[PDB]
Design a protein around this ligand. Sequence first.
Ligand SMILES: CCC(CC)CN(C[C@@H](O)[C@H](Cc1ccccc1)NC(=O)O[C@H]1CO[C@H]2OCC[C@H]21)S(=O)(=O)c1ccc(OC)cc1
Lengths: 99, 99
Amino acid sequence: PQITLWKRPLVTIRIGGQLKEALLDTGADDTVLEEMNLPGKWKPKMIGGIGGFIKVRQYDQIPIEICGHKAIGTVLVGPTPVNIIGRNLLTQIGCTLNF
Amino acid sequence: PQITLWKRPLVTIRIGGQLKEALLDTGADDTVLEEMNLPGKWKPKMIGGIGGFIKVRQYDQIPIEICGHKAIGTVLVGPTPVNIIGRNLLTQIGCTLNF
Ligand SMILES: CCC(CC)CN(C[C@@H](O)[C@H](Cc1ccccc1)NC(=O)O[C@H]1CO[C@H]2OCC[C@H]21)S(=O)(=O)c1ccc(OC)cc1
């Protein structure tokens, strides 16, 4: 599809039994999801943006379905105000910027 | 151009005869540049990111040429981690997401 940017590029994602709305975010290196209790091993990390840093938990090889497209990779979980699909998964679903 | 996302989508922008590198950031509503001087009236504003809120200076109707595409719009100046081109200007240059 083609997503214009008149509004926030929010799309439906699935992670296990949770459907969430998430931003397709070219400015995000990594995917950052709102607090959720995912199974498996993780490692602590700090990520920085406008305002400073937040602490997140890094989970690897997590399958995520983004608008029907399959992805699998690292997801960072922590107290973000919005779910963010970053470049690590955007590439996997074939996403480009065009103008 | 078509821009893939295996690398950060950094582009050269022209603003006030200066060349800067800025990140095409679909997860940003607003264009926010690191501390710089711009002419004219500005308004104090606050904006929030992943790490909390910051103070910025809001400049309206500023020309920026992004990859040779002309925009004229609002530019926020303040302590962002990196120069970002947000949706307010991405829309002006006809940028869309495609997958
Ligand atoms: C370092 C570049 C940029 C920060 C500039 C990175 N951010 C992604 C942005 O797209 C966030 C994504 C974001 C969106 C909404 C809320 C928090 C974060 N947008 C953002 O801060 O936009 C601000 C400018 O416009 C405003 O509109 C939205 C918030 C304001 S991020 O959320 O902080 C972030 C995401 C992933 C990541 O992985 C290492 C590290 C940081």
